[model samples]
Target: SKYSQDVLQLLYKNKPNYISGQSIAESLNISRTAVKKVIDQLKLEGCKIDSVNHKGHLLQQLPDIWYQGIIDQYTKSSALFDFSEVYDSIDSTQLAAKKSLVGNQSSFFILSDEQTKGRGRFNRHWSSSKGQGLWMSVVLRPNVAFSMISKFNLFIALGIRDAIQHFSQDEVKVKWPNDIYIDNGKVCGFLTEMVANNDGIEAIICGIGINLTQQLENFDESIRHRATSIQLHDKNKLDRYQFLERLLQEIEKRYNQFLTLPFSEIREEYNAASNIWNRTLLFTENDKQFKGQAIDLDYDGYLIVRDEAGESHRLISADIDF
Candidate 1:
């Protein structure tokens, strides 16, 4: 929402030189009006942008930034995952990751600059505008049973929260099985899908979406009230490349821990990241709606909610009203 940091890298690469608005728009595959809007916004943020009669806009200077090379170097070497890739555009990172599995490719990470059909839990459309958010998915072929798949989602949520806080220093937390929150607004979400053969899990694609630089007004009106980005909370720009590095590092560490640690310990850390405990929540399951006080996650990762009648219900999945 603030500005496309990708444009900054582009202009910075050719600093002291001028590039036309039309050219910049073409490079980003956006309209001239969109390119001009970003230039105007950058000027307001003290970027020292220069405009000529018709020559175009010039970026005199830019502050600390991170580009693709840094991301490429950091992700090239990983023991837990077999491959890593970064893309300028894609239909969906999740779709791509699933396709990789269909080809017999095992562990990997897929990062995209934008998604034409990015999605969230329950097939809800996710806004993945150019250079605004992190749309990524990690593929795994763990030998665990289907019941343990939810733990991987929690592991990823923890990884994202750790990575974001490493930069924002904000109080980041997890909500339920998936979705990371910061200051009462959602900053990240996770949607995991799996493929199974008769033996067991053949592949698991865990899609992660994090709103990094988008502003509140940049989101559609329907979700602006509750959606947020790192930039909305912190005015300074972050090196998205570094953020991804930290995220993957955290996830790899968590994955190893998941293999060696007890389930209760993992649940404890997840609960610590959650803020819904003891709060009133209205949720629906199997078309039945219920109002209850938020409880805790059970031993098997199901949400534990206590209704008005003091009865506890274990929810596999529920849409929280908040």
Candidate 2:
């Protein structure tokens, strides 16, 4: 596998120019036969490589595939997660993470090009077409208590918001619980699930879905006006692989800071990035709908709102209508 990556990197750097097999072997400290084997494997993986009689191999193009080798190039030195699993398509990265709990690895990431049964908060279906978005989940085994679990949602939302803003150079805002908004349209969503027992918390699976290159017609009729993609607002298309690399790195930085920093600091940052603050919203509580203005986030990450009756309410979990 190392030979495969090394040979591919060499070919990529010297694209359109042939490098002799003997030269490759000498550079990598491997045999000519081994170089041939690695080339054969790359061809099998859909890489376009040309080999001449006297000259060496030339790389024409790389396939739009996400495999272990590609993942290793991006996440090999990451301190947040150890193992990575990628799929061409899957039922859901969140489901795959749940099934992988039996393994010995404590933390890892699950990524897929598409999710057939992707879901968001309140069991709503998430639109995930092949090669249209970033469908991934991070499974972590944290030693924190159940009370602190809710904050993980905000943590991931902030991390992803920062990453997207870094590339798009747009003002991305987090909408309360777990949604990312840009220019009044929804661009991303997160689903955080916790696994625990009497012994304490077991693991937390944070599922993230960000619409990347989809156009207007790519979305369902109902959500076409409410949902948008990064490519739609920006002129250039995103390189998904490079975006994922930055995303993982940003998440790792946020996650480490979350474990070490004070809650007030995180809360202040999250509040500043929030989109719903001071906005009039309609929400239902105890079988009654109430009109309120979102004030701020409480210490436990719950939304604090002041109703029309001059009553303040702390919303634990409720959908707000603007």
Candidate 3:
């Protein structure tokens, strides 16, 4: 609702602008009169506009999120993402991204909002108490084979880690797969999934969770034991917008690296960020189970685990109990 109004404001308020009424009618699926009425109403609402007889209505500043602020730090890869930030809540940004991909929504993108849901890896749940933490998700389209996704989780974590380190002094650690830990406690969680087209995998949606402005009393007793938010330890508030902007930039950089570069080069960074690297582990998925000492990740992004019998197995995902 507000976004449309924002668009109108951008059209009329900004620079030299023109949106043909016919084109607007066709694009927005409204009658030509309706489009004219919308323009008239906006003009009546104290909006200043310079419109011609047949030219399109021009608004002022467009939606800021789409303007490349998210990942401005990595200016080169900024074009890879179609960034957006919503004021309200949604079930899941990942779901939103998936739907967008199915509808051919946009490029590598991140969706952020004050409240959202349908998160957690392997069917787990992620809770966002209004502004307590950062709630967001990213949608990716990888041309590589599906076999390398497991390692890609690490790739995702690197981007997140860089973002966190920039905002807070905390040393962010990766709890195998895709959880972010601080002081051995869960601080963030992500759910990574794939949207498949008829020919092959089309997109990878990763839902992100971060505890940013929450206190202990703000948490549920169940989560208080193992999880944490940004408010728990820090007294100074985080610069939320800056955090998101850097995150967008970092993500675009990492994602482009994943698409063009070999997995081996990326693996070096993953190993450096790995908190549970070289540890024995048990991972369970869909009632199937496996246990093995952790080994290295292959170029395709699969988890490498070697059993006591010296057999090695590569896994995509499961409950990682290290």
Candidate 4:
């Protein structure tokens, strides 16, 4: 509704200050009753509005509406992405990426306001409530050998951690092979899917779901104890367009470096971002579950876990039960 959006614009423009209902009514040429009704509607959508006795209203906080127009404006001046689209709703960003050609796929990005079937590693479900988090995927056409395909996930994880660390000074850590934790709670998760023939990799779709503005209460009860969001650190809701812009810049910068540098160059940095280094973890392989200490990542990005007994295990993949 243009009327509703205009009312929000006025409120956002007068952030931290109140505008009289009468003035807002006159500005929009709507009745005070109509203005009040829209304000009520906005509040129902989880906007943090402050109402005073006579001082009008203040927009304390609100979610970012980073739809096509907003993203179009941001990308014009600061170039990023070979192809990108912002959807009001999508079944899955990965599904959409797979359908697109994505010329020079390495420079492609796709985002959505809400994802119906957002994904997690090992076919888990990712909660993608509307306007709450970053539901996005990037396409990469790495020219590396098939053996090195696993390492690209590590590279993307590190880039995401670095980009987030720029805005969040909180304790950000990465849990191999593909989860990002803040303090002790999970804040982000990454999943990688690739297209290939018998020869080598063709295109890689890296889906990253970040919990940006959702509060603990916004999460389902099943995940409330295990998940968190960026809003926990900074209450001022983020502008989604700006957030993605910065993240894309960080990704492109690190990706260029990734092509030229050895894994050793980022080995120590990736280790530092890890949450489970030297910590105990429970995982299963070949129908046998084992408990071990996550010691380090090998040069190939495989997890090196030293078991409870005096034995060491190298794992390409495992679910961290603990």
How much lDDT does each candidate structure score? 0.76, 0.81, 0.64, 0.77
Give the candidate order by descending lDDT: 2, 4, 1, 3
lDDT (10s digit) by residue, model 3, range 1-322: 3234534633533347577777766766667777677767666654456668866566542221222222332333457665454534667666666766777746655445444455676556677665556677677777766655655666778888778766656667777677877656677887667766555557787778887766677778876777666445455656555566677777778777767777688777777776766666776767666677778777666777786568988866546775
In order of appearance, the predictions have TM-scores of 0.76, 0.82, 0.68, 0.77
How do all the candidates rank in terms of TM-score, highest first?
2, 4, 1, 3
Which residue window of length 10 is worst by lDDT in model 3?
61-70
Distance from true position, residue 19, model 2, in Å? 6.1
Best by TM-score: 2
- Model 4, which residues run further than 4 Å from truth? 1-63, 77-80, 102-106
The positional error of residue 126 in candidate 2, measured at the CA in angstroms, is 0.5
Instruction: Single out the weakest 10-residue window by summed lDDT for candidate 4.
Output: 66-75
Clashes by residue pair, model 2: none
lDDT of 3 at 203: 73
CA-RMSD of model 3: 8.3
**What residue pairs are clashing in model 1?**
1-214, 1-215
Q: How does residue 298 of candidate 4 score in lDDT?
A: 83
Candidate 1 deviation (Cα RMSD): 8.1
The TM-score measured for candidate 3 stands at: 0.68
